Ligand binder design. Structure first.
Ligand SMILES: OC[C@H]1O[C@H](OC[C@H]2O[C@H](O)[C@H](O)[C@@H](O)[C@@H]2O)[C@H](O)[C@@H](O)[C@@H]1O
Ligand code: BGC
Ligand code: NA
Length: 555
């Protein structure tokens, strides 16, 4: 009758910041304390420090090598002589977010108390969120700063005519900063609302539906939005110069680290004023470079909406890659294609964040997220070196971030923390170089019915990655899957039955010295060294538990 693993954890173990620069001290908080307990600090399965669990609050200076993930696990020796993991936390030592981005958002900037904002940022911190997209903070797409640099409006009305407080924006930036997170301001690349100044943005800058500059292209918005959004040509230099100035104004008032560039995606066949093809995917590269040039110390990320623009922008000055995923990219195998493709487009230079809104249909109404839906999709994304923008004040159910129709159960919260712990702790193995492989792995007891990736409903999918001298094997469990659509749009996906103590046979040519297992579903993701035999090319071992996602590491 065991509860889910995350939920069984006797201790909640937390750290003060989301991430740490080399040389910065990690301060831990445990919610409760147990006798006869030892803290193990691990790097890639290896214990690098042991110390007595001696109280609720203590510090650790991590090794200074940059871009390293660690797992911290606390072990109690029970009176029978068995050991229990009480709790675990992952730690990212990164000088900068761009290598291993864990992106979240914020969506409400009105009169929210400091203590309320604090609780929001603290929560994100515990997911190790290392940067935040500030969504619909801006006054206007064509003028994101309300007021002047000299005299910034303290209170402005947003695109749905709600109040935004300068102090709330500044406050959240400061709070994210205090947790080692980056703050990225949302705007479109090319957005104009109907109150823009026609002396500053001229007819010649707009994108049109026809070749005779008759009808302007636009994002149609109903109530409560104040305006439809007109579209300019991102390659037009006057627009680039205009928005560069708007950006500087923002940066002079609000200490954003950079600009989240949004777009509306493929607009079909649309034209410049002169009747020429606006071909927007090939306009974005010049736009990115102009924006970077105008503020070289400020970060840029740009959303390739369903991969529109991705190939064209992947070699520009973007911190990492971002894809909002839509039809027909609805299969699990389509998420991994997007990740494979982004690697290729960036020549293996940039990792990806996926904006991939879960339980999308369900979210038309108040409800709960379907926990197994969310977990299985993040198991796939994380196993394949992806990252998921999904968490702010609430978890995203729609492309309109303020939509908060769906809530997360306490069970999902607990589990998802272990998932973010997992993908932080083991980032070096998930998305830090190496080549995908196709391991020859077989059940030795018939408890598992194994296939390769991409997955089949009814089967455990095995996929491998060669990372340095290590062979990694991910098991992702579709045994009980009733759909291979990642979005679980109606919240129908099944919880996988636990498989326990499952014999595996693996062909591995080289000598094996150590095999270890880690699963976010087992012991908080703590690395567990496995017994094994090796006979020529043939390694045998047993995995303790597969539910959604287990990782086996052969050294
Ligand atoms: O669900 C409401 C609304 O959400 C999105 O549109 C509003 C969105 O439009 C652009 O992205 C602007 O730059 C943002 O400031 C706005 O929040 C959907 O696109 C739309 O279909 C939907 O009605
Ligand atoms: O145990 C030696 C030292 O280890 C470091 O990692 C901790 O940050 C110190 O507080 C401690 O005194
Ligand atoms: Na980081």
């Amino acid at each position: 009758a065991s509860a889910e693993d995350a939920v069984t954890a006797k201790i909640t173990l937390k750290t003060d910041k989301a991430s740490y620069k080399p040389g910065e001290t990690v301060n831990f908080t445990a919610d409760k304390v147990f006798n006869s307990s030892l803290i193990r600090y691990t790097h890639l399965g290896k214990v690098i420090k042991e110390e007595t669990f001696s109280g609720t609050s203590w510090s650790w200076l991590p090794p200074s090598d940059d871009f390293q993930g660690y797992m911290v696990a606390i072990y109690q020796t029970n009176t029978d002589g068995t050991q229990t993991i009480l709790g675990t936390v992952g730690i990212d030592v990164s000088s900068d977010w761009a290598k291993f981005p864990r992106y979240g958002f914020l969506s409400e900037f009105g009169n929210i108390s400091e203590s309320d904002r604090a609780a929001v940022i603290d929560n994100l911190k515990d997911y190790h969120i290392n940067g935040i997209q500030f969504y619909d903070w801006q006054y206007r797409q064509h003028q994101p700063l309300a007021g002047t640099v000299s005299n910034p409006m303290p209170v402005w009305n947003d695109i749905i005519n709600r109040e935004v407080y300068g102090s709330t924006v500044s406050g959240y930036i400061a709070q994210a900063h205090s947790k080692n997170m980056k703050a990225m301001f949302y705007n479109l690349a090319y957005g104009v609302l109907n109150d823009y100044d026609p002396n500053l943005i001229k007819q010649q800058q707009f994108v049109y539906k026809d070749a005779n500059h008759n009808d302007k292209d636009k994002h149609e918005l109903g109530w409560p939005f104040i305006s439809n959004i007109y579209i300019t040509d991102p390659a037009n230099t006057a627009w680039q110069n205009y928005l560069a100035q708007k950006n500087d104004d923002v940066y002079k008032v609000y200490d954003f680290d950079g600009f989240h560039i949004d777009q509306l995606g493929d607009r079909g066949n649309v034209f410049r004023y002169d009747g020429t093809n606006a071909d927007l995917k090939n306009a974005f590269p010049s736009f990115i470079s102009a924006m970077k040039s105008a503020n070289t110390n400020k970060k840029l990320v740009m959303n390739a909406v369903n991969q529109y623009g991705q190939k064209e922008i992947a070699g520009k000055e973007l911190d990492f890659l971002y894809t909002e995923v839509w039809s027909p990219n609805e299969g699990f195998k389509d998420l991994t294609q997007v990740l494979t493709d982004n690697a290729a487009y960036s020549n293996n230079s940039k990792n990806t964040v996926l904006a991939a809104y879960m339980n999308y249909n369900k979210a038309n109404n108040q409800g709960m997220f379907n926990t197994p839906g969310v977990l299985l999709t993040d198991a796939v994304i994380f196993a394949f070196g992806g990252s998921h923008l999904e968490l702010g004040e609430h978890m995203l159910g729609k492309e309109y971030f303020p939509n908060k129709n769906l809530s997360m159960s306490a069970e999902l919260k607990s589990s998802l923390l272990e998932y973010y712990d997992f993908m932080t702790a083991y980032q070096n193995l998930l998305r830090d170089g190496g080549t995908y492989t196709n391991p020859t792995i077989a059940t030795g007891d018939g408890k598992l019915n194994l296939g390769s990736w991409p997955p089949t409903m009814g089967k455990v999918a095995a996929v491998g990655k060669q990372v340095g001298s290590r062979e990694i094997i991910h098991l992702l469990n579709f045994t009980n899957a009733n759909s291979l659509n990642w979005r679980d749009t109606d919240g129908t996906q099944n919880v996988p039955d636990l498989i326990k103590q499952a014999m595996l046979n693996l062909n591995h040519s080289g000598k094996v010295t150590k095999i270890w297992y880690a699963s976010p579903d087992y012991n908080g993701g703590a690395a567990v060294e496995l017994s094994f035999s090796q006979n020529g090319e043939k390694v045998n071992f047993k995995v303790p538990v597969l539910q959604y996602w287990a990782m086996i590491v052969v050294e």
